Design a protein around this ligand. Structure first.
Ligand SMILES: *C1(O)O[C@H](CS)[C@@H](CS)O1
Ligand SMILES: *C1(O)O[C@H](CS)[C@@H](CS)O1
Ligand SMILES: [Cl-]
Ligand SMILES: [Cl-]
Ligand SMILES: [Cl-]
Ligand SMILES: [Cl-]
Ligand SMILES: [Cl-]
Ligand SMILES: [Cl-]
Ligand SMILES: [Cl-]
Ligand SMILES: [Cl-]
Ligand SMILES: [Cl-]
Ligand SMILES: [Cl-]
Ligand SMILES: [Cl-]
Ligand SMILES: [Cl-]
Ligand SMILES: [Cl-]
Ligand SMILES: [Cl-]
Ligand SMILES: [Cl-]
Ligand SMILES: [Cl-]
Lengths: 574, 574
């Protein structure tokens, strides 16, 4: 019967090592084999409502004749084995895909879909070389776990993401263990305390001493905290360099305020030349898909469009798993939610063709410290040789407000920055009030000429849309940890007092700065707990006590010989 | 096979009039008949992810051997007939329950669960007299549609709820019609415009002229706007007076910032003496179950506890549908999220036994206008005979901020009231800063001595928790429309200048006002668009042009002969 299906729970699938993973099979009433979609989930395959609202109304797929397999990853819930993030997912996906392809009900065409960890696992599956995998659809995901979500392109630890997620999984690890333990109740209370106060959890020094999380999930220290360089342990689990050799269609979703945004977009660029890639980017953060934030509303159109997403996924799978050549007729290659105008818009590529990468130079009379300073932005090089100076004290870092926060207040991406504008270590540079709109859509970066009293420190840059009423709304930001200025792999310290030209990767955005607005840039040396705080010592940061850390006198140089600037991806549409 | 199930889509169930309703059947792999749960849904039975996250992980029920039936209500999606809210749901539920009980796979025990409209329909089912219905679980619902969500106990129209919901259904009505229409695209745009700007939509005068909504859903005017009195049209669809004669177990869920809170709680009180009633109340609004708000966070424990809810529902249904006498061992009768302390707490009853209904009298030297006025609250009667006076202008009503908003900014219940504190028509009365905690848990009301220059007007009262940092956080509020001061059914006008003692029903709350806080009350004559604005004419409000309306000079009298006060449900726990 068309539209009818059955569900078989806890079908045990043997991996190459004999460890069995549990899957649930959603199989249509059909007369022969069918195309199959696989989802790999560390958050209980039974708990479909937890993630599905951030994805697709995928029961539509089943009603339309696809089978769907949802799997508990190794060591969690109904699966056997031991759980360690990332390290088993390439092999376990390969073995699972192989098992699916062998089944009576599989017609030889398999795809995947899902969000976050259910997205990362799709890249890990895609590098398997399993020919039967015809398409993937990774949403809010990464193919390089160092670059997102654990560290970043600037070489700072994404500490709130790490501690929040580890506490989240810690709840899952206890819930899914064999027998209940006397310490479980107290552990459950302590994990809740972390999730209620992620900045507090991240504030403990040495950062690497995590009695609870290190016990429940040793990986938090053994892999993440202990490996600050993008070293061999990270390279092992990275998929990114293998993406170029694939020819697997990928339907990629991202969010402008999502922790994974930079890495999600990079995956699109990596696969677009060799297969049918599609891109959808909305104004969402990882846990807020509503389009509504405390000081910024994007409109109901911005709410994660789950039925349109479902329709697009089905068309995509119809094309690539069912060989329906015209299934994607009228579907755009790229669909972006352009903020400011607050409208969806179709594009032919990402980056946009006809992106003008335009320097906006830091300038101004007098100090740029605070929002009431004299800092300017201009497409013209600054005429006078100046410098702005501030003290960065690790005991008092600049608090994270919006941006791509994941677990610490991660539901307010476009956050008003005014609460930090009176700080002396927040340097502000803005354009005059705009008389005509300026669209900035693409990857964003800064090139700063900097010096420090320290042998290591951080520099941050944050793009901001200043509204007529004074709201200073965050758009996108990045960090550079100075030891990693030239490489994430082989860091070196800097010489105190020497001027360096450094790049800050500020991920990406799409925003029209409307008439009456200003373009604003904030520069500092911290953004905590989005990123951990530099100790300004050159030491092993995560092993240092707060008292061991040093203050740094940091300086931004600006003028004709040191033309510090932000590079804006300008789009002009007449 | 235990834990396995099948799904049959679009099974057509004939009603008494021959009109067939579409249902989906989720039926366990079992050897005989099973207990059955029914959900009646106007938002597409296929779209389970849309509502389920506000309810239960109900696939657990199916894995555990319950069948679940989800039905499209009459005239929507796959169902035949014509849709009109409420009017067909008693009969259609009776006929559906009867059909279920006749099926080979039903063991004679049926229950229901679900939220909002999926909750209201359970009360409509419960009055059917169908013996096979053994238990219901209505969440965020009402048994009196006048009192919630369309009007209220004060006799003002809940205009934002009406217009927002009508636009929401209007999307559904177009989506589920026979053939696509040329006007659909433009209609879809206009509906989005309403949902993006509900206060704007509610601001049009006459309010009753609704070209779009009146065309798509004539009921919006024909029933709701046209019937401001709690008349026979409303009585017809009310279930409340029939609740006392039932003996049906009900698991009732409510939220402190939910539009239905007053009516949800009243249903518990109505059924508790005759059957096993249970109550769960969290700090949620209708569309925000997260525990997180712009200026108030309740902690992760406050996040809608969906797996605990699932466990409780299963225990409840095990007791009442499966006759498992000990299934509810250790389950509390009442479980409340007590704000301030921000903790869940078990109780034996609602209202709490040992509630001290305590008057807090309005007082103070000089005018109470604005937060910087002299208004006080005290358990002692005020010594001097005073009055506070203000102009209420319908062209400039007090904006709604938080509270029990549904569609207009309905995601910020505990909203900071400071943005309206400089208004001359907002009278503020507060206690001194508290040195010891004061718990207020229960139903809340005000008794005010009032006068007006007009023959009709409104008075509002809003309970507020003032935090050390100045945040003035809304707790619960109500309104009285003066023509309905003595009855919602047979209104009469007032005499200009005469003093009336009126009651304002302020719904309910649970809050510990902690040391360093103040208890605050705001009094005014508007709260728009939570409630429509009184025209101050005595006329048919929804038919008046703004220009036809009048300003009113309104007065609150306070002192020994006019002891205006709020009645707080004080709980003392030592
Ligand atoms: C997704 O499920 O949420 C996490 C946010 S850090 C991420 C871990 S790879 O996956
Ligand atoms: C629920 O589904 O949302 C509506 C809010 S007004 C309500 C109508 S009875 O049901
Ligand atoms: Cl089988
Ligand atoms: Cl293992
Ligand atoms: Cl262990
Ligand atoms: Cl806005
Ligand atoms: Cl749009
Ligand atoms: Cl372009
Ligand atoms: Cl100097
Ligand atoms: Cl130089
Ligand atoms: Cl059958
Ligand atoms: Cl009909
Ligand atoms: Cl029609
Ligand atoms: Cl708070
Ligand atoms: Cl609690
Ligand atoms: Cl009590
Ligand atoms: Cl007078
Ligand atoms: Cl009198």
């Amino acid at each position: 019967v068309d539209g009818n299906y059955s569900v078989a729970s806890n079908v045990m699938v043997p991996m190459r090592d004999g460890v069995r993973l549990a899957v649930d099979l959603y199989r249509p009433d059909a007369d022969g084999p069918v195309p199959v979609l696989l989802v790999r989930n560390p958050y209980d395959k039974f708990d479909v409502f937890a993630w599905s609202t951030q994805s697709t109304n995928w029961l539509e797929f089943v009603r339309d004749g696809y089978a769907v397999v949802i799997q508990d990853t190794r060591g969690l819930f109904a699966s056997e084995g031991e759980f360690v993030p990332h390290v088993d997912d390439e092999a376990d996906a390969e073995d699972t895909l192989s098992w699916i392809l062998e089944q009576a009900w599989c017609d030889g065409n398999v795809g995947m879909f899902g969000v976050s960890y259910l997205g990362v696992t799709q890249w890990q599956a895609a590098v398997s070389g399993v020919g039967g995998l015809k398409a993937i659809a990774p949403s809010m995901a990464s193919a390089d776990l160092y670059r997102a979500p654990w560290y970043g392109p600037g070489g700072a630890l994404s500490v709130e993401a790490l501690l929040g997620w580890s506490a989240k999984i810690g709840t899952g690890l206890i819930t899914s263990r064999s027998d209940a333990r006397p310490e479980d109740a107290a552990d459950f209370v302590q994990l809740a305390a972390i999730l209620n106060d992620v900045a507090g959890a991240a504030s403990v020094t040495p950062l690497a001493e995590q009695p609870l999380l290190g016990r429940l999930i040793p990986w938090v220290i053994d892999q993440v905290v202990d490996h600050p360089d993008n070293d061999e342990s990270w390279q092992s689990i990275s998929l990114f360099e293998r993406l170029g050799g694939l020819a697997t269609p990928a339907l990629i979703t991202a969010g402008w305020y999502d922790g994974f945004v930079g890495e999600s977009l990079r995956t699109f660029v990596a696969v677009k030349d060799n297969a049918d890639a599609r891109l959808v980017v909305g104004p969402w953060s990882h846990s807020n898909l509503t389009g509504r934030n405390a000081d910024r509303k994007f409109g109901i159109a911005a709410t994660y469009p789950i039925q349109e997403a479902t329709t697009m996924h089905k068309a995509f799978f119809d094309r690539h798993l069912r060989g329906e050549t015209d299934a994607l007729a009228g579907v755009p290659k790229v669909r972006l939610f352009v903020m400011g105008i607050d409208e969806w818009r179709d594009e032919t590529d990402w980056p946009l063709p006809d992106t003008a990468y335009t320097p906006f130079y830091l300038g101004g009379s007098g100090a740029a410290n605070t929002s009431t300073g004299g800092g300017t932005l201009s497409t013209s090089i600054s005429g006078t040789e100046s410098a702005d100076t501030y003290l960065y004290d690790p005991a008092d870092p600049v608090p994270s407000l919006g941006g791509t926060l994941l677990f610490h207040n991660g539901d307010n991406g476009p956050a008003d920055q005014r609460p930090i504008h009176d700080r002396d270590d927040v340097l502000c540079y803005s354009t005059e009030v705009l008389t005509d709109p300026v669209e900035v859509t693409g990857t964003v970066s800064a090139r700063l000429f900097v010096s420090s009293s320290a042998v290591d420190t951080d520099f941050t840059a944050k793009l901001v849309d200043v509204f007529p009423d004074g709201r200073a709304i965050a758009l996108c930001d990045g960090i550079v940890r100075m030891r990693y200025r030239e490489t994430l792999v082989n860091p070196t310290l800097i010489e105190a007092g020497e001027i360096y030209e450094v790049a800050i990767d500020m991920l990406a955005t799409s925003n029209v700065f409307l008439p009456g607005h200003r373009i604003m840039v904030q520069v500092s040396s911290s953004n905590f707990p989005k990123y951990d705080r530099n100790s300004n010592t050159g030491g092993v940061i995560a092993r240092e006590q707060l008292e061991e850390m040093c203050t740094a006198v940091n300086r931004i140089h600006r003028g004709p010989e040191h033309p510090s600037h932000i590079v804006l991806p300008i789009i002009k549409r007449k």
